[PDB]
Amino acid sequence: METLKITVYIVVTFFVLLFVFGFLSGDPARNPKRKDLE
Amino acid sequence: TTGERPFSDIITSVRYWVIHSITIPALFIAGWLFVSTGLAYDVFGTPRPDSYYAQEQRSIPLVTDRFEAKQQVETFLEQLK
Amino acid sequence: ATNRDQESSGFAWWAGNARLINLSGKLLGAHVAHAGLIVFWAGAMTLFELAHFIPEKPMYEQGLILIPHIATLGWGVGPGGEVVDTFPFFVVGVVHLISSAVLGFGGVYHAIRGPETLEEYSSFFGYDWKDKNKMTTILGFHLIVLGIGALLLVAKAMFFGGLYDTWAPGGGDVRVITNPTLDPRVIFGYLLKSPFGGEGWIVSVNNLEDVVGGHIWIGLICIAGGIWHILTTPFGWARRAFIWSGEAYLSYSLGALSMMGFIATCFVWFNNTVYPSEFYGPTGPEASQAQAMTFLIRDQKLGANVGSAQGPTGLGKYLMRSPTGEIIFGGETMRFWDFRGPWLEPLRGPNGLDLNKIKNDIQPWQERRAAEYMTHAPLGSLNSVGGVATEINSVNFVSPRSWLATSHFVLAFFFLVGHLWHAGRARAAAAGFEKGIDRESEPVLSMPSLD
Amino acid sequence: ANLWERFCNWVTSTDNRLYVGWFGVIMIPTLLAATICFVIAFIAAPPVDIDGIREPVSGSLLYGNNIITGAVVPSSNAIGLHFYPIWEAASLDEWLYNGGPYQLIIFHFLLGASCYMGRQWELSYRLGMRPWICVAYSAPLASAFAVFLIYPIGQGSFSDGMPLGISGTFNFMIVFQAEHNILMHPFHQLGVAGVFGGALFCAMHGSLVTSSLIRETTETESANYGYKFGQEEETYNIVAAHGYFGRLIFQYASFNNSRSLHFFLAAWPVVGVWFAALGISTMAFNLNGFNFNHSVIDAKGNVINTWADIINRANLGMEVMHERNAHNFPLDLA
Amino acid sequence: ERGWFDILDDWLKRDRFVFVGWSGILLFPCAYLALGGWLTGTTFVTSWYTHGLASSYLEGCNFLTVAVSTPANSMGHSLLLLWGPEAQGDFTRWCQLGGLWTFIALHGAFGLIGFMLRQFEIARLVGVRPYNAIAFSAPIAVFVSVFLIYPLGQSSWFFAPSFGVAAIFRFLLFFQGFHNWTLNPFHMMGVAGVLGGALLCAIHGATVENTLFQDGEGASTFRAFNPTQAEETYSMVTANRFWSQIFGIAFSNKRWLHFFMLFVPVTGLWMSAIGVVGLALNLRSYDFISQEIRAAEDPEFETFYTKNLLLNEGIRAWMAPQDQPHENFVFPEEVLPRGNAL
Amino acid sequence: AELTPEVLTVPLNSEGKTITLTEKQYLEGKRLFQYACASCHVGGITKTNPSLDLRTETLALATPPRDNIEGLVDYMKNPTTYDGEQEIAEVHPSLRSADIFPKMRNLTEKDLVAIAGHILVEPKILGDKWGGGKVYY
Ligand code: CLA
Ligand code: CLA
Ligand code: CLA
Ligand code: CLA
Ligand SMILES: CC1=C(/C=C/C(C)=C/C=C/C(C)=C/C=C/C=C(C)/C=C/C=C(C)/C=C/C2=C(C)CCCC2(C)C)C(C)(C)CCC1
Ligand SMILES: CC1=C(/C=C/C(C)=C/C=C/C(C)=C/C=C/C=C(C)/C=C/C=C(C)/C=C/C2=C(C)CCCC2(C)C)C(C)(C)CCC1
Ligand SMILES: CC1=C(/C=C/C(C)=C/C=C/C(C)=C/C=C/C=C(C)/C=C/C=C(C)/C=C/C2=C(C)CCCC2(C)C)C(C)(C)CCC1
Ligand SMILES: CCCCCCCCCCCCO[C@@H]1O[C@H](CO)[C@@H](O[C@H]2O[C@H](CO)[C@@H](O)[C@H](O)[C@H]2O)[C@H](O)[C@H]1O
Ligand SMILES: CCCCCCCS[C@@H]1O[C@H](CO)[C@@H](O)[C@H](O)[C@H]1O
Ligand SMILES: [Cl-]
Ligand SMILES: [Cl-]
Ligand SMILES: [Cl-]
Ligand SMILES: [Fe+2]
């Protein structure tokens, strides 16, 4: 159970970091019209 | 457009309100008196608050005979007084 | 009539307030007039409550939501939450009502008489939504204001007579807080607690020292943040993450208010410290616990050995164990064993409810309180018939906790919807397609087929 | 481009057969976990002590259920609102007895479905659409939140969350009626107007557009071949449809503006379902349906029943029989 | 050739604010009398002699509790005509016996026929296909199944739904407790058609509104549509890509889409009606025999199916004496099914 | 049926004397019972001890007898267990315990008589519903 907990913690942190860094990665500019929204 | 006078013309006209400032309150008052005079109870056969049960009765006057139902209701009504 | 039809503004009457987006003077008026409406209601509603208030009935039998907020600050009440003086309630109501006139005056003036834009009137008061530095400045001012408000609570609790403390030794009473909790391990510890059962995140705050200490931190954090935001401009990574427009900013605040609303719903539903049960009635968990307590007392008076009494299921009829072994009340209230309240805690030992305390130490005040709370559980109909859904008409009661939790759920929910509506629109407007797809430049038509 | 850049370009790509996106990065794993657990549990899970009274209820197919009776059973009343991940159990056997799969499934699902809503915004943005499909999806989503999270919170237990099953759903409905008189609550009434009206307007829109399709085919082919995907010209005559409907009722009761019509089609069911969801979410804190029990009294004080009192008798039946071994004290307070 | 029939036909079909037609001769009186009867009864008329209930504003009921209630069980399926053998021409007695119930149900039935005839008549005049009339067959099948067929299979009109908000709720709960109607796959198909229809309504409206072409300068986008325009107001191609990518499939054919919008809720309603026809005969989906065999033999075997039947048994025992007064049920406290404490 | 003077005539004492309450007294009694008592005693039951109800026959068998105005008025001043053996003012609303049950603070002697009359009159109207609980709803 301890190993499972840690594994899930690491899995969740991995995906959450992808979500946050991903939306921080110039998301307003990822559209088909006007990109210079900064 | 289907030929009739626009509603918005009608209800913003003075003549409409001359008429309806009478007829509307007349109808409302007549409905009021239909109840306040007790006429409504008589027309529809609805019990008044004192007429659901005889004084000591606690049995519903349920209709149990299809063809004598009118007479049963009448007997129930007699039992009140 | 500047920008006051659809043809000139681009917005229909039903979105008419969007005509204000770039008219800073008229928009100031709308905001100040609105603040007036809020303050008016606080004032008027208090006076209505006071007019309708019978001092010797519990507040919670009287449909009161505002008097309980004033009482919780220590005004007008004494031991047990008894009302000792209604004048503080009158003062709060009157001063709010008077103040609303002033806000209404300013609001109406800026809305229909003052300069419709502020920018050519004043560089200080005018603003462009897209000016990042000016937006953080105004944000900064408002943070300072909010921090001063949090420190007002601190000042009330420490220097101006205290707060109502349901936990006060020997019975609830107004108490001055002399040792607010400053330790950041405790204060920020609440913030990292699980929101699940037995933990309850910030809603678990259960003593006034932590509450006051919390506001000391918040007030200082907010004042510092305000100075920071006045003295800086947003960094590159923030510039790249956000949409910078009035509608975008609205969206972010709607999101925030939604979140706060759901939190407030949970606070009034579970918390009996900053929402004392003396004023708000028992919590749902509290009343269910109180029922078990009531019948334990009754049946034990009759000779029942309540520790050894096996219920129909094999679990203890009155007392059983929680999943970690603590002695708790039985029946369906097993779910509520995390409940804590001053009338019950004297019966609690290190391993939970203590059988010797139960057998020997239950005082008549505890019996009274449990009976009171069991019979004022937060259940009732929309037309304010108290009790279970099958109960007959007789008791006119809906708990203030039910009114407050339901209203704030509804409002938080629609605010989430507004967050989504305005955030999605802000995005589309910023990118230039909020009015629809350009027929001659339809993006999908330039993309490869999916298959 | 570096790896992170390339990865971001792929995640947000408008060319993936199924859009991934940042929402999708959370949605995909959480939905897969919820789905896989649900399927396995629905098939093979042992009985679960839903009511915390050591009275296990069998939900799975292998333990004597069919598709209609089967369910993944809510977590135990002993747990209440406590968080019961696999790793808080001493063993999977305990986890199973106590209804651990329920929590794993509903939490992964609610997270995943919230990200499904976000993903609808996200793709609309990538494709240059207007953004509010996600707002329409907030209606069913809010409803799932109400029955799986908000109601449990209010009542103090995930044991009172809607079961993941067909009969389980009906159990939740009947007990909800007993406890809240939901039928008499105006928010559930708005919900009914929302779905009956959504169905009515669905049929009405379908029938009126179908009525007015322009002749482009012969009698030995489907009229559907008269429309080609992506053609510029509208395929029905809205003027004829309005001509029809405006005479069916009267002129100003019919929409001649397609945008206004399609907005109404969105708004009617969405708003009604938002009120349905809010009904459940506010009955969660026991503000219940209208109670007119014994509201009509005669001159003496005899109770004169109305149809509300008959409802009340049905409700009482439900109340006294539900969870027949779980109550020890006279009032059902949660 | 130019005779009175043709002249009347002319008049009936004039293009006026409210279209009349030949169908109007049936529709207007029947609809007016059904609506007027409902308003009359809910406002003034009791259910004391038929049900032992107050049912009107006059007696103190509100919009939720008023009803025009069914006749006494002893009337059987009597047409209950004003001039019939029960009321014998006495309007007051007729009201007291529940004559307004058959009045409303029968004028309502003929009114619905008139409405569907109107849909046909108008379609024919304007030159459209009669799918709206076809779709309205669902409401007809529901009305006929629930208000006419159901009570006709039962003992009397007593057991039809009474026309009232709370009265209809009572009808739902009766069907749960006595028929286990939630368990019926025909009701389930109903549910799926109604909820599915609501889904399609929401999703189609939102999709059109979110794939609009920019056809004006306004931020409020309704004015950028002209009824007479040739072109689609929204992009089917963008809508199609969106849904293909979000959900995996998407509509590509607008005629199919709008046909499906007819089919789903219409088919659902029609299925629910078939189930109610079975309930007329108590031909229920009440039980799973395999479940009952197991549970009878094994006192540890419990499912949500068994739990619901216990609820049903409560409903029946607790509601029957007041809900079925003609049976004169007396159920001593000691026989009433109850769980612990409650 | 009407709320007659006969319905409103109830025993004053254990010795055969009666008192005929006015319609205003009946209404006051209902209001006051709702105000001070119905949170536990709605419909003539007792939510915190369902074994004891407010039925007239139950009150007759209480010690001292509580099936008359004097017995009920005395109960509201100095409540006892059903056998008369213990004084329960510390856990039951009474004038004697108005300090801890503050709703009792404003009740006058007139008010106690009205509440008492309500307890005696209501079963005359409602029959077994009075003290019957949910079974008779
Ligand atoms: C809290 C609610 C609120 C507030 C504060 C505002 C504020 C405003 N709206 Mg909005 N609006 C609202 C709700 C609100 N709105 C709602 C619900 C709708 C939909 C019906 C609208 C629809 C709408 C449209 C279509 C338009 C506005 C516009 C405006 C602005 C100009 C109004 C004007 O020219 O008045 C002219 C009216 C008068 C001169 C009549 C009197 C109005 C005053 C303020 C009444 C005050 C009474 C009060 C009791 C006085 C107390 C005084 C005392 C303290 C001394 C103003 C800033 C306009 C705008 O954007 O301009 C650029 C605009 O075109 N609004
Ligand atoms: C957020 C609220 C707010 C903001 C940003 C403004 C902004 C402005 N107002 Mg308005 N106004 C307001 C509220 C506001 N007003 C209210 C409530 C009223 C009713 C009394 C008015 C009545 C008003 C009039 C009649 C006029 C203005 C004018 C102005 C302009 C010049 C202000 C100035 O020079 O003061 C400079 C600074 C001072 C005079 C010192 C400040 C003194 C205040 C009282 C200190 C209070 C501080 C305290 C923290 C406030 C707590 C509030 C809280 C309890 C709610 C400026 C655009 C003028 C204008 O537009 O010219 C055409 C103008 O003639 N305002
Ligand atoms: C209403 C109050 C408020 C608002 C709207 C803002 C807004 C802003 N601040 Mg400020 N700030 C504030 C108060 C506020 N601040 C206070 C009180 C302080 C003092 C502590 C600061 C100190 C501060 C600093 C030091 C900086 C900012 C910066 C910023 C900018 C970027 C913020 C951002 O990316 O957030 C979003 C947050 C993140 C992207 C961080 C990671 C997200 C995690 C995972 C969120 C997890 C929480 C989750 C939802 C659960 C809630 C419960 C939780 C408490 C456990 C933006 C202009 C930045 C800037 O540009 O300054 C010029 C910056 O460097 N602010
Ligand atoms: C299209 C219009 C229309 C339709 C279809 C109906 C249909 C009905 N009405 Mg309604 N009604 C209407 C308009 C209509 N009504 C109007 C305008 C009024 C206000 C005056 C009423 C007032 C009314 C009342 C008060 C009642 C009815 C009732 C009825 C039902 C029984 C009718 C019956 O047995 O007729 C039998 C007659 C015919 C079918 C006519 C046939 C004509 C033939 C073809 C010609 C032969 C005539 C012959 C020469 C006569 C000689 C007899 C002589 C030997 C003595 C039926 C549902 C009853 C009901 O609902 O009970 C529950 C009832 O009590 N209706
Ligand atoms: C803009 C606009 C708007 C809005 C507005 C607003 C929102 C306003 C507000 C306003 C306000 C917000 C106002 C207020 C006022 C107040 C006042 C006027 C007060 C007074 C007071 C007094 C007089 C007092 C008295 C008393 C006392 C002192 C004590 C006790 C008793 C008594 C109470 C008597 C609208 C929507 C219309 C639209 C158009 C535009
Ligand atoms: C007073 C008090 C207290 C304390 C308090 C405190 C200390 C608080 C704090 C608070 C805090 C400290 C808070 C925080 C918050 C945060 C948040 C809420 C966040 C948000 C975020 C966001 C929203 C983001 C977004 C995004 C991302 C994710 C990335 C990408 C993009 C974007 C940017 C969009 C206590 C409890 C002790 C007691 C009672 C009283
Ligand atoms: C049966 C009968 C008959 C007939 C009758 C009739 C035809 C009647 C009619 C009646 C009517 C025709 C009535 C009416 C009434 C009405 C009412 C009673 C109304 C009410 C309303 C309301 C209450 C409303 C409300 C509202 C509004 C306004 C808006 C929105 C919101 C609400 C909904 C709140 C005859 C003689 C042949 C024969 C024998 C039997
Ligand atoms: C309470 C927590 C306290 C946290 C304090 C620190 C604040 C958080 C800072 C996050 C910094 C991330 O900064 C962000 O990183 C990503 C990842 O390379 C950058 O990189 C991105 O640049 C462009 C921007 O148009 C994208 O097209 C590209 O795909 C990507 O590489 C962003 O342009 C940068 O702004
Ligand atoms: C912003 C307006 C606030 C008005 C402040 C009123 C003081 S409040 C006052 O403070 C006293 C000590 O000085 C306490 O003894 C007393 O209990 C308290 O009510
Ligand atoms: Cl159950
Ligand atoms: Cl219990
Ligand atoms: Cl008894
Ligand atoms: Fe369409």
From Swiss-Prot, chain B:
Q: Which residues lie on this side of the membrane: Cytoplasmic?
A: 1-17
UniProt GO cellular component terms = photosystem II reaction center; plasma membrane-derived thylakoid membrane
Which is a GO BP term held by this UniProt record?
A: photosynthetic electron transport chain
Q: Where does heme bind?
A: 20
Looking up InterPro entries in the UniProt record yields: PSII_cyt_b559_asu, PSII_cyt_b559_asu_sf, PSII_cyt_b559_CS, PSII_cyt_b559_N, PSII_cytb559_asu_lum
**Cellular location(s):** Cellular thylakoid membrane
Cofactor remark from the record? With its partner (PsbF) binds heme. PSII binds additional chlorophylls, carotenoids and specific lipids.
Among Pfam families, the record links this protein to: Cytochrom_B559 (PF00283), Cytochrom_B559a (PF00284)
Per the record, what ranges lie on the membrane's Lumenal side?
Answer: 33-81
Q: How does it sit in the membrane?
A: Single-pass membrane protein
Family from the record: Belongs to the PsbE/PsbF family.
Q: What does this protein do?
A: This b-type cytochrome is tightly associated with the reaction center of photosystem II (PSII). PSII is a light-driven water:plastoquinone oxidoreductase that uses light energy to abstract electrons from H(2)O, generating O(2) and a proton gradient subsequently used for ATP formation. It consists of a core antenna complex that captures photons, and an electron transfer chain that converts photonic excitation into a charge separation.
The entry's protein name is Cytochrome b559 subunit alpha
Starting at the broadest rank, the lineage of the source organism is: Bacteria, Bacillati, Cyanobacteriota, Cyanophyceae, Thermostichales
Curated annotation (Swiss-Prot), chain D:
Q: Which residues lie on this side of the membrane: Cytoplasmic?
A: 1-18, 124-131, 209-263
**Cofactor comment:** The D1/D2 heterodimer binds P680, chlorophylls that are the primary electron donor of PSII, and subsequent electron acceptors. It shares a non-heme iron and each subunit binds pheophytin, quinone, additional chlorophylls, carotenoids and lipids. D1 provides most of the ligands for the Mn4-Ca-O5 cluster of the oxygen-evolving complex (OEC). There is also a Cl(-1) ion associated with D1 and D2, which is required for oxygen evolution. The PSII complex binds additional chlorophylls, carotenoids and specific lipids.
Predominant cellular place of this UniProt entry's protein: membrane
Molecular function in Gene Ontology: chlorophyll binding; electron transporter, transferring electrons within the cyclic electron transport pathway of photosynthesis activity; iron ion binding; oxidoreductase activity, acting on diphenols and related substances as donors, oxygen as acceptor; oxygen evolving activity
Taxonomically, which superkingdom? Answer: Bacteria
Q: Which reaction does it catalyse?
A: 2 a plastoquinone + 4 hnu + 2 H2O = 2 a plastoquinol + O2
Please report the record's description of how this protein sits within the membrane: Multi-pass membrane protein
Site residues (Tyrosine radical intermediate), renumbered to this chain: 151
Task: Quote the record's binding site residues for Fe cation.
Answer: 205, 262
Query: Is-annotated flag, keyword Translocase?
Result: no
| Record field: transmembrane | 19-36, 108-123, 132-146, 187-208, 264-278
Q: How is it modified after translation?
A: C-terminally processed by CtpA; processing is essential to allow assembly of the oxygen-evolving complex and thus photosynthetic growth.
Detail which positions bind [CaMn4O5] cluster.
160, 179, 322-323, 332, 334
Q: Per the similarity annotation, which family is this?
A: Belongs to the reaction center PufL/M/PsbA/D family.
Protein name in UniProt: Photosystem II protein D1
UniProtKB/Swiss-Prot annotation, chain E:
Q: Name one Pfam family in it.
A: Photo_RC
Topological type in the membrane: Multi-pass membrane protein
What exactly does this protein do?
Photosystem II (PSII) is a light-driven water:plastoquinone oxidoreductase that uses light energy to abstract electrons from H(2)O, generating O(2) and a proton gradient subsequently used for ATP formation. It consists of a core antenna complex that captures photons, and an electron transfer chain that converts photonic excitation into a charge separation. The D1/D2 (PsbA/PsbD) reaction center heterodimer binds P680, the primary electron donor of PSII as well as several subsequent electron acceptors. D2 is needed for assembly of a stable PSII complex.
Where does the UniProt entry say this protein principally localizes? membrane
Q: Where does a plastoquinone bind?
A: 204, 251
Residues that, per the record, bind pheophytin a: 119, 132
Q: Care to name a GO molecular-function term for this sequence? A: chlorophyll binding
Q: Which residues bind chlorophyll a ChlzD2?
A: 107
Q: Which residues bind chlorophyll a PD2?
A: 187
The EC number(s) given in the record are 1.10.3.9
Q: Where, by residue number, does Fe cation bind? A: 204, 258
Q: What class of enzyme is it?
A: oxidoreductase
Origin organism is Thermostichus vulcanus (Synechococcus vulcanus)
**Hey, which stretches end up on the Cytoplasmic side?**
1-29, 131-141, 218-267
Segments passing through the bilayer: 30-50, 114-130, 142-155, 197-217, 268-284
Q: What is this protein called?
A: Photosystem II D2 protein
Show the Gene3D superfamilies listed in the entry.
Photosystem II protein D1-like
Keyword set, alphabetical order: Chlorophyll, Chromophore, Electron transport, Iron, Magnesium, Membrane, Metal-binding, Oxidoreductase, Photosynthesis, Photosystem II, Thylakoid, Transmembrane, Transmembrane helix, Transport
Q: Which SUPFAM superfamilies match?
A: Bacterial photosystem II reaction centre, L and M subunits
Tell me what else is known: 2 of the reaction center chlorophylls (ChlD1 and ChlD2) are entirely coordinated by water.
Q: What reaction does this catalyse?
A: 2 a plastoquinone + 4 hnu + 2 H2O = 2 a plastoquinol + O2
From Swiss-Prot, chain F:
Bilayer topology: Peripheral membrane protein
Lineage, top-rank taxon, reads Bacteria
- The record lists heme c as bound by 37, 40-41, 92
Q: GO molecular function: any one?
A: electron transfer activity
Electron transport keyword on record: yes
Subunit text: PSII is composed of 1 copy each of membrane proteins PsbA, PsbB, PsbC, PsbD, PsbE, PsbF, PsbH, PsbI, PsbJ, PsbK, PsbL, PsbM, PsbT, PsbX, PsbY, PsbZ, Psb30/Ycf12, peripheral proteins PsbO, CyanoQ (PsbQ), PsbU, PsbV and a large number of cofactors. It forms dimeric complexes.
Gene name for this UniProt entry:
psbV
**What GO terms in the biological process aspect are recorded for it?**
photosynthesis, light reaction; respiratory electron transport chain
Cofactor(s) listed:
heme c
Which keywords label this protein? Electron transport, Heme, Iron, Membrane, Metal-binding, Photosynthesis, Photosystem II, Signal, Thylakoid, Transport
Instruction: Name the protein family.
Output: Belongs to the cytochrome c family. PsbV subfamily.
Instruction: Tell me where in or outside the cell this protein is found.
Output: Cellular thylakoid membrane
Part of the whole protein covered: 27 to 163 of 163
Protein name per UniProt: Photosystem II extrinsic protein V
Keyword Iron assigned: yes
Offer a single GO CC term for the protein: plasma membrane-derived thylakoid membrane
Bound cofactor: record note:
Binds 1 heme c group covalently per subunit. PSII binds multiple chlorophylls, carotenoids and specific lipids.
